[PDB]
Each structure stands twice: as structure tokens, then as C-alpha cells.
Design a protein around this ligand. Structure first.
Ligand code: HEM
Ligand SMILES: CC[C@H]1OC(=O)/C=C/[C@H](C)[C@@H](O[C@@H]2O[C@H](C)C[C@H](N(C)C)[C@H]2O)[C@@H](C)C[C@@H](C)[C@H](O)/C=C/C=C/[C@@H]1C
Length: 389
């Protein structure tokens, strides 16, 4: 225990200075955590990847070192994201085909129509406008509600609850988590009696009414699909508008060459690495070069630091939309690698694409060293991003 964890980011785009020294090392950095349990931080691309696919690393919440007084296992609440193979595998198998490349590519039309209407609505407003509230959150939310069949009318309730649920060191995360489960509990009971199409109702029909999945399991993974599905993209899109605004050439080059967008999106994902500080524990000894991780040791997986690893990515702190960037780990790696990632990328490609095609002189409406940054959550972002045109 040298540096304390959790560490919060301080800048909308800078990673913490410490991370780069962490990578210059021969060991893993030890960290002091609320419960005094042995815990390493993991900073190198080589390492992050090795451990995330290793079979002796667990997500079991009871093995993770406790990071605060409010941090806990959630009273037996488990999504697939909190299970190891083979139980993990059974649950992810039921949801996977909805998310394949070619399957996700069939939603492009509905995503385009969706973002079209948000932009019409947004451009009707007197600027300056906030991107998170008027572009990023509306699209991620509508898109996830369409895929899942969750009512958009409910979005104020589940948005605010997801935000709070995803703060594991905050008092309010438990009641919000309880309420979200309760909301999906009612929704799944409804869909059970009246299956719709859309991912939840299709799983009622094919898995739940066929004996492949229980009621609590569907409910729990529905919380996960709902919250992951909007809160993440919302922040990635917001931060990305900032970054493109911060590098004007990039906005205009994309606007003038859309075939450059997919790699640009991957570069935005790498650069910001908004999902960070993943929690794992060793279940057996694990040899990583010089260092021997011991049965029971906690691990804090820094996707961001690995995405900014100099030994893998040249000029790591630079935003560069021409570096092949497909091999970043913004969506993790290994069994739990983001089930949504093709949907995330499509959403971004269409949202950023249409926004700068339409508001081609979009400008920052505030100075980007007065941005509030989100702290205390494994999903980074900024509270607000004001723009003019
Ligand atoms: C930019 C957007 C997103 C980023 C950066 C992101 C990142 C990640 C990361 C890092 C993980 C792994 C966490 C871990 O191993 O502990 C993950 C898992 C997950 N993501 Fe995402 N994600 C995004 C969007 C989405 C979207 C749109 C969906 C749609 C529902 C989604 C669904 C999931 C699911 C279900 C998992 C759990 C997979 C499993 O445990 O097998 N994600 N994501
Ligand atoms: C790293 C990004 C993932 O962040 C995540 O995986 C986000 C995980 C959030 C933290 C977890 O919330 C914490 O859960 C604990 C078990 C209890 C804890 N509180 C009550 C002490 C609660 O905050 C999850 C369970 C919140 C659910 C709303 C939810 O499924 C969130 C899933 C989000 C997925 C993101 C992909």
C-alpha cells in the first residue's frame, strides 16, 4: 500500500500523472484501500490483457477488496458481469446474438432516424446548449429503449438511478440499485405475460418460457443492459465532441471523409478510456514477469493507462485519428469484453457523423478548463458540455 485507491481523474482529457510512472516499473504498484487488503494497480497494456483473460482472475464480488464503508456485494445481486465462467458463459450466450456485428448493423436505420430527430430538436433551441442533456443522453437512451423495449417515458427515473447505482462508494448507490431492480422486476413480469419483440421480450419467449433462465437472472441482466447501454455511450459521446472540438482539423476531415469515422471512433475510445479501474482478484498465484501475484490479491485494472501505453501506442497522449487503433482495450478484454461494443461504435459513428455534418461550425461555448469532471465512478465523464453555433 503506497498510493491510495480509488484515484479520481482531474482533467477531461489528461490521465493522472502517476499512471506513466506506474508503467515505467518492474512490479505492480501496491495500493492502500479502505479494508487494508493487498491490492495491486495494473498499468501496462501487456499486463492488463494478460490478467483479464487469465482463468485465475475472478469477478466474484465477495473476493474484491472493499473500497469504502458503502462498498459491498449488493445483497446477492449479480449480473453476468459479476460471474465467472461457466455461469458467466451460460448467461452471456443468451444475449450474444442480439449484439453481433451483422445483427447490430441492422439497427443503423433506426439509429439514423433517432439521431436525426434529436438534432432537429436540438437545433431548434437558442444556444448555448448542453451536449449531454440534448444530444448524448437522448440518443443512447432512445437507442437502448428501442433495442430492449424499455419505456422512454420512464427515462428520468432510470437515468438518475443508474447514475447513482454506478457510484459504488456512495451511500445512495444501494437504494437506487434496489429501485432499478424493482423497476425491471415489474417490466419483466409484464413482458412475461405479454411478450414483445425487442431484446427483453424475445428472451422471455426463447429463454425464460423455455427453462433457460430464471426471472431474477433476466431482471438482473436487464438492469445491466439498461444502465451499461445508456450511461456509457452518453459519456463517451459527450467527451468525444469536446475532443473533436479541441482539434478542429479532425471535425472537418471526418465531415469531408466519413470512411475515416470508424477508426476515429476507436481512437476516441482509446484516448478517453472512460470505463476504468476494473476490479478483479487472483484465485491462485499468478506470475507476471518479475512479480508474483498471490492467491487472494485484489487487482485494479487501469484500461486507460493501458490504452495510453507508449510501448503499444506511439505518442500516447496525442489524439490521432490516423493511427490504427482497433486493438485498444476501452471495452475491456477477455470473457467480459463489452457485449455492447458494436452497438457503442455504431452509435458513435452516426451521432458524431451527423452532428458535425449538420452543425458544421459547432463551437465550444465555455473554456474547457472549467469543465466539471465526474469522480467516484468506474465510468468517467463530464457533468455538462455547452456548445454554440
Ligand atoms: C462507449 C461505450 C462503452 C464502453 C466504453 C464500454 C466498456 C465496457 C467495459 C470496459 C466492460 C467490461 C467491464 C469489466 O470487465 O469489468 C463492458 C462490459 C459490458 N458492456 Fe459495455 N461499454 C460500452 C457500451 C455498452 C453498450 C452500449 C452496451 C449495450 C447494452 C454495453 C453492454 C455491456 C455488457 C452487457 C457488459 C458485460 C459483458 C460481460 O460481462 O460479459 N456496453 N463494457
Ligand atoms: C466499467 C463499466 C461498467 O461499470 C460497472 O460495471 C458498474 C458497476 C456498478 C458499480 C455496480 O453498482 C454497484 O454494485 C454493487 C454490487 C453494490 C454497489 N453499491 C450498492 C455499494 C453498487 O454501486 C452495478 C451493479 C450497477 C448496476 C446499475 C449496473 O449493472 C451497472 C452496470 C454497468 C456497466 C458498466 C459497463
Amino acid at each position: 500500500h503506497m498510493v491510495v485507491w480509488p484515484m479520481d481523474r482531474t482533467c477531461a482529457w489528461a490521465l493522472p500523472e502517476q499512471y506513466a510512472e506506474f508503467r515505467q516499473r518492474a512490479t505492480l504498484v501496491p495500493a492502500k484501500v479502505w479494508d487494508g487488503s493487498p491490492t495491486w494497480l495494473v498499468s501496462r497494456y501487456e499486463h492488463v490483457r494478460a490478467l483479464l483473460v487469465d482463468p485465475r482472475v475472478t469477478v466474484d464480488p465477495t473476493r474484491q477488496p472493499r473500497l469504502s464503508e458503502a462498498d459491498g456485494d449488493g445483497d446477492g445481486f449479480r449480473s453476468m458481469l459479476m460471474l465467472d465462467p461457466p455461469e458467466h458463459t451460460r448467461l452471456r450466450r443468451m444475449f450474444i446474438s442480439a449484439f453481433s456485428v451483422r445483427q447490430v448493423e441492422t439497427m443503423r436505420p433506426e439509429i439514423e432516424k433517432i439521431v436525426d430527430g434529436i438534432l432537429d430538436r436540438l437545433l431548434a433551441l437558442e444556444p448555448p446548449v448542453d451536449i449531454l442533456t440534448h444530444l448524448a443522453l437522448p440518443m443512447s437512451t432512445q437507442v437502448i429503449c428501442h433495442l430492449l423495449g424499455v419505456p422512454y417515458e420512464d427515462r428520468e427515473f432510470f437515468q438518475e438511478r443508474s447514475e447513482l447505482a454506478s457510484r459504488p462508494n456512495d451511500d445512495r448507490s444501494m437504494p437506487a440499485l434496489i429501485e432499478l431492480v424493482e423497476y425491471l422486476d415489474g417490466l419483466v413480469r409484464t413482458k412475461t405475460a405479454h411478450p414483445d419483440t425487442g431484446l427483453l421480450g424475445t428472451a422471455v419467449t426463447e429463454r425464460l418460457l423455455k427453462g433457460e433462465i430464471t426471472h431474477q437472472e433476466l431482471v438482473n441482466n436487464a438492469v445491466l443492459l439498461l444502465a451499461a447501454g445508456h450511461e456509457t455511450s452518453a459519456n463517451q459521446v459527450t467527451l468525444s465532441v469536446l475532443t473533436l472540438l479541441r482539434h478542429p482539423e479532425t471535425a472537418a476531415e471526418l465531415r469531408e471523409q466519413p470512411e475515416l469515422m470508424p477508426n476515429a471512433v476507436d481512437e476516441l475510445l482509446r484516448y478517453h478510456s472512460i470505463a476504468d479501474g476494473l476490479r478483479r482478484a487472483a484465485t491462485a498465484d499468478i506470475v507476471l514477469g518479475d512479480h508474483t501475484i498471490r492467491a487472494g490479491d485484489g487487482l485494479i485494472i487501469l484500461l486507460s493507462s493501458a490504452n495510453h501505453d507508449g510501448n503499444t501506442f506511439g505518442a500516447e497522449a496525442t489524439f490521432d485519428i490516423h493511427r490504427p487503433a482497433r486493438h485498444h482495450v476501452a471495452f475491456g478484454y477477455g470473457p467480459h469484453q463489452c457485449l455492447g461494443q458494436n452497438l457503442a461504435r455504431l452509435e458513435m459513428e452516426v451521432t458524431l457523423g451527423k452532428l458535425f455534418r449538420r452543425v458544421p461550425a459547432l463551437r465550444l461555448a465555455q473554456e474547457p478548463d472549467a469543465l466539471r469532471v465526474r469522480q467516484g465512478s468506474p465510468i468517467f465523464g463530464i457533468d455538462e458540455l455547452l456548445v454554440e453555433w
